[model samples]
Target: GGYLKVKMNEFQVPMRDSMLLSELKQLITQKIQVPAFRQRLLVQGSNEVLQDGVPLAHQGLRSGSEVVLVVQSCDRPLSILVRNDRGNNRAYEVQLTQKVARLKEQVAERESTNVDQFWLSFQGQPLDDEKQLGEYDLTPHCTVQMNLR
Candidate 1:
């Protein structure tokens, strides 16, 4: 119904505290998972490519600036696995089947069967895939919101 943006504020610390801001920035970015899709997803198109409707932009993360991310598609069924980073900062693989089932669950939760309404079928085609991070016709938009702790 709307869009999504991930806003990361700069970590404020007393100047006396000895850690370098650059080091902190690196640490923060490394721990942040918001931009992982760019590294993991196979994207196509011009201007930008997104899983759902989120756009990619370098916001020079600060205390107030919001990373406005939006992705939009025509009629493609796309899915992605979501995982929380763990174990020595490694990313775990997500299964495609689970992602599809998650999408279907979301659709059911919204109580709509019209595949087009949910971008479940794109360009009048069914979205059937068994591959992880695959695209289909009924995909509309996907987004991620990250807030630094």
Candidate 2:
């Protein structure tokens, strides 16, 4: 029976209980004109993004609780250029939120190689699997060189 307040840009929305995250996104889209997938919601005082499937109660939200919305870039795929040990080059389109591990798998599939034996690098530095592609600050058509371990 608690209410939640969501802030995005300069607008605020007071929400009733039992509202789904999807429903909230719809309201936000109407109010702010931002698409749902591009919206990132963070509970105030926390850095974690709110899960879409979880309820507000599960997130410990109560009456007068506040959340912030950060608008992410539109869904655009990045072209990753992978160079293998054999000096062969290939390209893959990757989402910004995609993990490096998933990109490696895609590259392995394209090259008909083993995923375990291959690694991804940006600017000659190894990439971490747990991080999202956007964290790498990669631009569109950026090169993500691959190497063997």
Candidate 3:
């Protein structure tokens, strides 16, 4: 497998051709703690962002090639603390690109509630399902409360 370097906005990571874009993003997420959804990876000197489904080998990436990782200023990983009406509490790592409804569904499955009937709040503000997490200005380890209607 060929080796390459991924140049992020502020750092760099070495990668191999055997890795998938999605896997690369996950590694980057763990490195920078930024959610995968907020990560935009592009080949150096190119404007097109790399697709997660594609492999580096098929993308024409070779040894010593550099890929750029761009994370949105408003994007971050969230550790939502969900407390159901039953008093059960749990935490989940979420991405800004994920819809609130998806998060609700996950919480509902754990809490045994109707996903559509539940609501979430952060900092005393209601969360919208249609909006991305980045729109909420949430940070890593931020807590969110869950309520069932």
Candidate 4:
């Protein structure tokens, strides 16, 4: 139940023992350009993958030392394009699996305050960011244009 920082060169932000891996990810995306979902947040390639439920106060994160994240969270990352109504899209790399209300949650974090604005779908599209990523078909129903086809 204390404070520390994820130091990067001369840049670092305060961290806490009470923080969850999921919460810390939110902090990172705000402080850095890296997306929360696309983060591994490891300790020198730690043997175990840091799950969302893990607490910051445990393991190496407890030390609050120089732990640098490599940005690449997983190899199976779905190469996707987050599109908007105006055709403005940002490239995002994230795994196809999410449970915490998916899509809008992370996008809001990435683009900042875009959550309450609107979703990428309307009209023919369902704006179905929930359920499976498979719901966003091959542009059949205005789904996310993901992966190499």
Candidate 5:
């Protein structure tokens, strides 16, 4: 798992959009559901991506939907992992903007300041940001680790 923008262009949308919210939402939904989506489901081709009423059955995600995510960090160089628990040949890339913002906000509210003490990584690896294409088991959850550096 790497950066969301790179994954979106390679796996979901090819062209970039100017609206930050729209792009972020698209990345979250697509990456969340694509890995477990029965097939190589493209957001551009799926009913959820195209139609208003239809959504992906298994992933339980819809277009223009919002989900609340809570993230906590103890130290710097945060290790991140994004896993698909749906038990399919699915790969995922997380949207850094939204997820990191949420985590930072939570930390600020708790700690009283934005301390950049940690570097972000995925599954213990430095943010090399290459595509991760493989199958995963539907247990222990898909992990996105952000370790403290």
Candidate 6:
């Protein structure tokens, strides 16, 4: 686990990469005593908003740097579609703050299949297991295609 800093209000709190961004925020909450809903963590040098259910390494943060924590009630569940090449489809209502892994479980459950049997993609890009839906900006009716493995 490598160290990186969370900078907010001109102060930097060093944290490690071993934790998910979701937990990282909670960790921040424990320190600053701010509600998680009001915290926004983003890449310090970029506009890419840091999201939950993802590791800092997965988001390309290495080299021991800073991800700026900015300044919400988090609302709006994302309603997305999942279609298979085999012609089966399903709709999922979720929060963008959640994990792709969660969708895998639901798809497996409702479809009477397994998460291992297929791959998920959005607009031709494969969705990895360790990511948040917010990173994709695929929301509220975006179609994620499922392909047999």
Would you list the C-alpha lDDT of every candidate in the order shown? 0.31, 0.77, 0.75, 0.55, 0.34, 0.75
Question: What's the best-to-worst order under lDDT?
Answer: 2, 6, 3, 4, 5, 1
Q: How do the residues 29-61 of candidate 2 rate in per-residue lDDT, one tens digit apiece?
A: 888776676777777887567787777657766
Q: For residues 1-149, what per-residue lDDT tens digits would candidate 1 score against the true structure? A: 12112323423222122323333333334655323332222112232322332222221222322332232231223343221122111122233334444554454343434323333333334344343334431211332111112
TM-score of each: 0.23, 0.50, 0.48, 0.43, 0.23, 0.49
After superposition of all CA atoms, the RMSD between model 1 and the true structure is 17.4
Compose the digit string of candidate 5's lDDT tens values, residues 22-59.
34445554655522222222333232332223333223
Best by lDDT: 2
Which residue pairs overlap in candidate 3's backbone? Answer: none
Question: In candidate 2, what residue range of length 10 has the lowest lDDT sum?
Answer: 8-17
lDDT of model 4 at position 7 = 40
Query: Measured by TM-score, how close is model 1 to the native structure?
Result: 0.23
Q: What residue pairs are clashing in model 6?
A: 38-72
TM-score of 6: 0.49
Ranking by TM-score: 2, 6, 3, 4, 5, 1
lDDT of 6 by residue, 83-142 (tens): 977766688987777788888888878777789998788999998889987677674677
What does the lDDT read for residue 61 in candidate 1? Answer: 28
On lDDT, who's better, 4 or 5? 4
Runs in model 5 lying further than 4 Å from the true structure = 1-33, 37-102, 107-114, 127-141
Model 1 residue 112 distance off true place after TM-score fit, in angstroms: 6.4
Worst 10 contiguous positions by lDDT, candidate 3: 8-17
Compared with the true structure, what per-residue lDDT tens digits does model 4 show for residues 13-96? Answer: 566556687776777778776656556665544544556665766756664454556565433546456665556676555444
> Lowest lDDT 10-mer window, candidate 4?
140-149
